[PDB]
Amino acid sequence: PLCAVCGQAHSLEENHFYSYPEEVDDDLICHICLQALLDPLDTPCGHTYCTLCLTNFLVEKDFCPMDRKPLVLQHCKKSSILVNKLLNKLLVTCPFREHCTQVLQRCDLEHHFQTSCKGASHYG
Amino acid sequence: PLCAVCGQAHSLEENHFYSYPEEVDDDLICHICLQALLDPLDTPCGHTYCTLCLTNFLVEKDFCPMDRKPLVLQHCKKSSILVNKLLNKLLVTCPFREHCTQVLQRCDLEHHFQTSCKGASHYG
Ligand SMILES: [Zn+2]
Ligand SMILES: [Zn+2]
Ligand SMILES: [Zn+2]
Ligand SMILES: [Zn+2]
Ligand SMILES: [Zn+2]
Ligand SMILES: [Zn+2]
Ligand SMILES: [Zn+2]
Ligand SMILES: [Zn+2]
Questions:
Q1: Residues 6+ away with beta carbon under 8 Å from A95
Q2: What proportions of chain A, in percent to the nearest 5, are helix, strand and coil?
Q3: Are A37 and B83 within 8 A, CB to CB?
Q4: Which residues of B touch A (CB under 8 A)?
Q5: Could you say which DSSP state residue B116 is in?
Q6: Contact (CB<8Å) B81/A28
Q7: Which CATH class is domain B1-124?
Q8: A63 CB-near residues (< 8 Å, 6+ apart)
Q9: What torsion, rounded to 10 degrees, do the Cα atoms B58, B64, B68, B71 define?
Q10: Considering only alpha carbons, which residue of chain B is nearest residue A80?
Q11: So where are chain A's domains?
Q12: Closest to B19 in 3D by CA, of B32, B8, B33
């Protein structure tokens, strides 16, 4: 099932997926999934993971992956505006590569699909 | 009075000061002092400022500078490990320019003074 937000085939239970043409800073990479952070969540111990990744992690485990300190989801908090701004401006390559060559900021890919991507218009 | 940590002339009531040879991302700049963040503090509304800057700001004002939402210091929290890692690796130029040309990561300047700076050894 092709996602209308990121243009990749993934389930409703999985993260959005992106292809980054310029390398992403290792400090913006989620330690659970090894992709650039999406919907970042902070732990009380100061670590940061994708919301979906930490949520799924804590169903079958009960510690922070980075320091093994006990951890529960309800004391985690969405990351700051600053962190979201740094992630939103990461460059991504449109996944409809047979129709489109567009590189743009990650926060703008959905809009690109809705307005001016020949791939999204075609679909497959 | 020359600071042993940053090598600049400033009082105990003022921030550390640095010269950045490569431009710093605007999203890492403190909106109060307009320098790259030092000892970053997050507000409940998700904004980030230097600890010293927000502390001094809130003595004579009682709102978040970015959104004018009422704000008190005691509900602010130190920024995440991620944010600190991004700031620590910013490049700075040794301030003892008549003795030394060293560029290094901001978190390593103090150590440079203590071990291998001809400026710091000389002082003035
Ligand atoms: Zn998606
Ligand atoms: Zn993740
Ligand atoms: Zn942790
Ligand atoms: Zn496209
Ligand atoms: Zn100083
Ligand atoms: Zn400041
Ligand atoms: Zn605010
Ligand atoms: Zn030096």
A1: A6, A7, A8, A19, A119
A2: 30, 15, 50
A3: no
A4: 25, 27-28, 42, 46-48, 78-83, 85-86
A5: S
A6: no
A7: alpha beta
A8: A69, A70, A71
A9: -70
A10: B46
A11: 1-124
A12: B8
